[PDB]
Amino acid sequence: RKYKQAAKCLLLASFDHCDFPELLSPSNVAIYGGLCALATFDRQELQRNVISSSSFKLFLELEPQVRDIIFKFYESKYASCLKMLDEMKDNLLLDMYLAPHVRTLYTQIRNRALIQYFSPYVSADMHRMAAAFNTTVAALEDELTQLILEGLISARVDSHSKILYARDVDQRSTTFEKSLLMGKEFQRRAKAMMLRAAVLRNQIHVKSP
Amino acid sequence: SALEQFVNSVRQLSAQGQMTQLCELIKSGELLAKNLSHLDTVLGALDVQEHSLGVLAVLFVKFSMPSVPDFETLFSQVQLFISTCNGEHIRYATDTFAGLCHQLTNALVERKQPLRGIGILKQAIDKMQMNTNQLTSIHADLCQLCLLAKCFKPALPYLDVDMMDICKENGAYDAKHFLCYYYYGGMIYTGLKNFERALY
């Protein structure tokens, strides 16, 4: 599950080996590799890995499906992208080896679908966007609520807006509050250790009985 | 006889020449004869200065009846000893505190609660605690009180001091003393709801 070096090799597909029936079906070869990547990557080097993929280009050209899948994925047609995503749900299941990580994959998939589109905006409107992702308004916002559980933007929603506003502005005052929290626990520890010097140097302990 | 210059020690010979007798060895009595009323002429009147070493080692041969019927009379002059005769290094005043006052402690909620000693008696309590409201089991008694007994005020003075400077130093303290200390600390800042202080 350290799929970083996994895709590091997946990109490394060298057709000129040209034969091993136990190796992988080139359908599975490309889908396997590139989707380990599509989990692992950050977009830039991977587009490099993808748009500027040369050694994999046959492996590239194997599945036109997954090819334009990840293409317009990074181009963000999330609707049909996710569509064929959880359509090959069943067939990755049909992979013995795609089955064991379907949850992992689809998890990080819709995660990074978020990560992809959400980053530029400032206030997450949902209406047309939900029309895209094809998640019900509640299911949409609860996806979002999930997102709240971990998300990166100091963001809030008028539900009646049916729309987020994303992360806030200041980090300075943030530093301020962490600073004061710092200082308070500092003084706390400090008295603690004063009293600790007392208890030690005052011989203090607890017997066993 | 048994107090010829000994009461003269407390009155007169404390802070005197070769009179270093009572303090150093750290109470409703201090002599158990018929003249338990003569236990109350002048002991809690003046001070607890350098008369420390000897006469307690001399007079630890009676050690009986620390709970004489002077529950208000010698209690009165010990509230004086709080006020009038608080002392020099009053940590060792925990003796009567230990022997009698916990003795007295046993009766307080045994009557109602510490009706009569708290307010004034903190005078020589703090005469005892030199600097930082320094730790004693006086804390233990009164603060178990203010925790469970519905009387939380007199240590409201003493609430969040970083009190320190305990005395092991010939006893003058006990594991249970600090145990109770941060224990009622916990329970009271619970009830007082400064939960972080007590968790600390």
From Swiss-Prot, chain A:
Gene expressing this chain: GPS1
Tissue specificity as recorded in UniProt: Widely expressed.
Modification Phosphoserine occurs at: 208
Cellular localization per UniProt: Cytoplasm; Nucleus
Comment, domains: The PCI domain is necessary and sufficient for the interactions with other CSN subunits of the complex. Mediates the interaction with CAPN8.
Domain PCI: 9-171
Family: Belongs to the CSN1 family.
Self-association and partners: Component of the CSN complex, composed of COPS1/GPS1, COPS2, COPS3, COPS4, COPS5, COPS6, COPS7 (COPS7A or COPS7B), COPS8 and COPS9 isoform 1. In the complex, it probably interacts directly with COPS2, COPS3, COPS4 and COPS5. Interacts directly with inositol kinase ITPK1. Interacts with CAPN8. Interacts with USP48. Interacts with ASB4; this interaction negatively regulates GPS1.
Domain of life of the native organism: Eukaryota
Designated name of the protein: COP9 signalosome complex subunit 1
Record's function text: Essential component of the COP9 signalosome complex (CSN), a complex involved in various cellular and developmental processes. The CSN complex is an essential regulator of the ubiquitin (Ubl) conjugation pathway by mediating the deneddylation of the cullin subunits of SCF-type E3 ligase complexes, leading to decrease the Ubl ligase activity of SCF-type complexes such as SCF, CSA or DDB2. The complex is also involved in phosphorylation of p53/TP53, c-jun/JUN, IkappaBalpha/NFKBIA, ITPK1 and IRF8/ICSBP, possibly via its association with CK2 and PKD kinases.
Curated annotation (Swiss-Prot), chain B:
Known tissue expression: Widely expressed. Expressed at high level in heart and skeletal muscle.
Compartment(s) where it occurs, according to its Swiss-Prot or TrEMBL record: Cytoplasm; Nucleus
Biological role: Component of the COP9 signalosome complex (CSN), a complex involved in various cellular and developmental processes. The CSN complex is an essential regulator of the ubiquitin (Ubl) conjugation pathway by mediating the deneddylation of the cullin subunits of SCF-type E3 ligase complexes, leading to decrease the Ubl ligase activity of SCF-type complexes such as SCF, CSA or DDB2. The complex is also involved in phosphorylation of p53/TP53, c-jun/JUN, IkappaBalpha/NFKBIA, ITPK1 and IRF8/ICSBP, possibly via its association with CK2 and PKD kinases.
Miscellaneous comment in the UniProt entry for this protein: Amplified and overexpressed in some osteosarcomas (OS), suggesting that it may participate in TP53 degradation in OS.
Subunit structure: Component of the CSN complex, composed of COPS1/GPS1, COPS2, COPS3, COPS4, COPS5, COPS6, COPS7 (COPS7A or COPS7B), COPS8 and COPS9 isoform 1. In the complex, it probably interacts directly with COPS1, COPS4, COPS8 and COPS9 isoform 1. Interacts with CK2 and PKD. Interacts with the translation initiation factor EIF3S6 and IKBKG. Interacts with ERCC6.
Family note: Belongs to the CSN3 family.
Protein name stated in the entry: COP9 signalosome complex subunit 3
Shown segment, full-protein numbering: 3 to 203 of 423
